[PDB]
């Protein structure tokens, strides 16, 4: 439970998507 | 154990931040898996509002005691 | 127990908080439930603050009563 | 019978150079004690404490300098 | 009634930022009731303002009248 | 049985005039080594030590003051 | 044996008072230089810099007007 | 014709010193009771209060101090 | 009339201050009679920024004369 | 050489702040190797966000332990 | 000639310290006033005024001081 | 042309300052020149942001030594 | 053994619950000394300061009571 | 030889207890005057501005109080 790995997941959602 | 009046303040606010912080991530997964959609766009910007605000209202409340508590030392004598 | 001047006058201000700290308790929990309103994190931050400016004047009008009474006595010679 | 030196006499006549201030800040303190954010009544209770303060000091100062003069003047009996 | 001349300063200032109060509830009212123009913020806004350095104004005032008599009375001896 | 002069009867009925300060002071010190953060508690202790400050000011001046007129006093009856 | 007096038994009442204050700091501290977005650290840290920060302005206020009492009660020795 | 000793004329030169700072602050204070915001008009307001403070501070010190200077040639008549 | 050491400061930051007070008024009619290009709003933003200037600045300078000597007056024992 | 507690204190958070650098100056040098993507562009949020956070934590330590015992240094006598 | 003595010899030796800071600050001030945004001008006037700040205090300091051992020694004489 | 230890830590900035201030205009002209491209702007902007770091980075440290040696004049006594 | 008068006796005697206290406070400013920025640290050494001058005006203030009492009774035997 | 009393003692104890505290005050601005937005000398160039900062107090602060403990004893013989 912390805020840097909700980050990482934003920044990793945000090209999940893209492909 | 020790938890002092800041760290009760905070406490009450602890629980809180912990199951935003939960379900903003249930509803960025979601988003993820089905973006075709506005309404859970809108339910996401609406659950990190929430998550964002309730956190400045922990962050605020605590620093509003900070300057009581340094009056009340500045007239402690 | 014991009750002088001072502390007197400092409970002048304890009846307030007696209610004051029940009711800014209240509106931090109903906060808590929906706070993506501003209206919400607005009436809070007021009524923490009222508090703040209260403890505050019970800090003032307890440290100025001891440098008024503080002058005869050092003033007794 | 209240009896009044002359410095009690000074001190009474500061006394009874301000008619009720002591209780004015009494009821500036309990009407604050209620509402304590009004703008005109945090004016008054300022102005009245400060007064009041200014008031207490100058009456222990001059019950001292009277003190200083008159020991002065009978020290000098021998 | 006694007033002294912190209380005549306290008043000179009083009958202005009443007054000025009024007017920023009544400026506040017609902001609720047409929160669409944002002159009217602005109008508000700069009342709420002008009341603040009003008060401000006053406390300064009562502060600086205090400290120079205090100073004064201190060379009382 | 103890032996207490004019000094020390006055020093010992101003004492006795006021009731438990002392140990109110140090249970509302443990208090608020217990959580130094109450707005309350601190507000409380701050009120009991300027109380007791003034309390203890007071004694010793009148203690000193009775002290310089018994000396003036028996100073002059050689 | 270190002595304490009654200045020193006070800052020493304060110091037993907070348990694991300075440690729970520096722990702070060392988690912040690792995982410094985490909520759970992030406000703990702030609300117990902030309590340790009061703690010691309580410990050297209090010890500070102590010693103020002490020294005016000691000057009307002479 | 009043008796006016040497801290009389001192105080006297003061006040003859200054032309009419007395009403300058006086009006200063009624116009920002009217209007504060001319910055040319609570200019005028800071540097009148601030040198009437100046002033007021400094004849008292003065006049503390040649009091203090008559005192001590007063005492050493003896 | 009469004239201190710090009337004649204020004074001399008055001289300039007025020009201000007459050219923020003329700038903001400009920017009034063609609010579509940008630079008149930057000319008014940095003017009265300016005039801000000016007025923290003569502040500024009145507060530390003051205190220059104050420090002084706590001393002529 | 030598160094006190606030140059350790500032020293603990400069064991990330040179990675942090390393790791942002490789994100900018990524980006430029292939900008067509929004993943890289969160990645520089996620990347000088924390970059900002480490320098205001840091600078908010030494804030606070220079106040901490600021005031404990006004009245140590 | 007008005759300087030891409290006006430090105060002198103290203007003689500096070789033209009130003109500096003095040039400080109206090339403010003529235009207050130049950043070298604004900075080198902060410094002047700072130096005339601490001048004058450490200057008022110092000589009272020399007053206050100048006291001391003069108590003793009788 | 007297020069005190304020005025040495002025000019160790001075020389510094006023090349980035006659190097902000080199830049804007440049800017004006060729407005299409956002390529240079970014350089503008970095610069004009390190000019104002000098100017407060010497406000704050002739700030810090004005209340350091201003308190030991004031214990001085 | 060198002479030890009744206010050496006194002086010497308002030393044994203060034992160490003038190595204490050294070895507490050595301490300051290799970092003053700990606020434990920095407080203890407050602390003892404190201690140490409070010891100090007490035991002159005791022994110049002593200097009068024994000068008051000695000048009675012309 | 160079002459030095226990206030200069002091001093001088705390000037040895740093050790190039001036001297790295002196490199860490002259660093920042040609690289202010770097990092790793500007939480440098806080820390240590903060350092010399109290450790000027510090001292300062010592100083006076043992000089105020000094002239107690000293005023304290008569």
Known sequence: ?????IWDMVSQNISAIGD | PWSGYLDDVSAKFDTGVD???????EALDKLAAKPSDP?????????????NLYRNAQSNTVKVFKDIDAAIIQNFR
């Not at chain 2, 199951?19 to 991530?25: F, K, Y």
């Open chain 1, 1 to 5: 439970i912390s805020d840097a790995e």
């Open chain 2, 19 to 25: 199951n935003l912080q939960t379900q903003v991530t």
């Open chain 2, 39 to 51: 309404a859970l766009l809108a339910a996401y910007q609406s659950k990190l509002s929430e998550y």
